[PDB]
Amino acid sequence: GNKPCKGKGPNCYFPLQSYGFRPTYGVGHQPYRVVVLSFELLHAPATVCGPKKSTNLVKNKCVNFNFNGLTGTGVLTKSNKKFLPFQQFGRDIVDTT
Amino acid sequence: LNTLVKQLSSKFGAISSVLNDILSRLDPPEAEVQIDRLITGRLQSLQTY
């Protein structure tokens, strides 16, 4: 309302409001316990992975590879690229890994 | 040629532009729906080229 109701009374209401929670209370209005879990999926290397083995690193061969969820197919060699210690994966022109 | 290669990294209204990510996240009935937008976009780019 337009009136400045300082102190709980007419037309000024408390924000919080707790409902009644009873074991034999009505169906539909019953309490329910909710966990919602949110992700961030990207093609870049990630932090939390699933449980899988770590195999071995095979070079100079056509293999399927999976680094931190970054999957692909190709030949892995050793290159003299000066990655900074935060920089994880490189990417050339027109966005290819 | 650079435009044709660079056009391969757009989504065309899908969840991602990477096809293996689409196959490794969704069930096949929704995966085909996600793939068809990429198929139409890449056909259109090839025909213009």
Binding site: D92, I93, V94, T96 | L1, N2, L4, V5, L8
Partner: peptide, 28 residues
């Protein structure tokens, strides 16, 4: 080649060609 043909060859400047690996080839 003639000297003039060498200026014509050198003047026309013909990682970029490493990104045709998505199904495209250039024929000689």
């Amino acid at each position: 080649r003639s000297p003039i043909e060498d200026l014509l060859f050198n003047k026309v400047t013909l990682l970029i060609c490493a990104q045709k690996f998505n199904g495209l080839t250039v024929l000689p």
